[PDB]
Amino acid sequence: IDELTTRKCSVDARLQAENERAERQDRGLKEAETTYAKLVESQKTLVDFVRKEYEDTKHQKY
Amino acid sequence: IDELTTRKCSVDARLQAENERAERQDRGLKEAETTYAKLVESQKTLVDFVRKEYEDTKHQKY
Secondary structure: OHHHHHHHHHHHHHHHHHHHHHHHHHHHHHHHHHHHHHHHHHHHHHHHHHHHHHHHHHHHHO | OHHHHHHHHHHHHHHHHHHHHHHHHHHHHHHHHHHHHHHHHHHHHHHHHHHHHHHHHHHHHO
16 A cells, blocks of 8 residues: 555656646647737738738839 | 555454454463363372272272
8 A cells, every 4th residue: 555655646746747737738838829829810911911012012013 | 546445454354353263262272271270180189089099999908
């Protein structure tokens, strides 16, 4: 029981920290998902913003 | 953990059953060992009386 308690204490400590790892991963993607979401909205809008400038630049010269 | 704990509890309960079994043997032994001491002392006493009885039988003859 004590020998398995050492396994029990080890597995409990690592999993209770693994739950911390799991939530640390959750906050890890939270920024990653947000930043990717922040980029894709910014990426698409700024590209067409350039096209908008590009269109008028083409319009003025063509 | 749970499978090994109930193994510990079961053997502890069974050991208590084994504990009294030797206690019954011990308490019975003490009564039996002491009782035979009186019997063998009486056994030697009676054969001593028989030894005296053999002397007594021929003493009346004399």
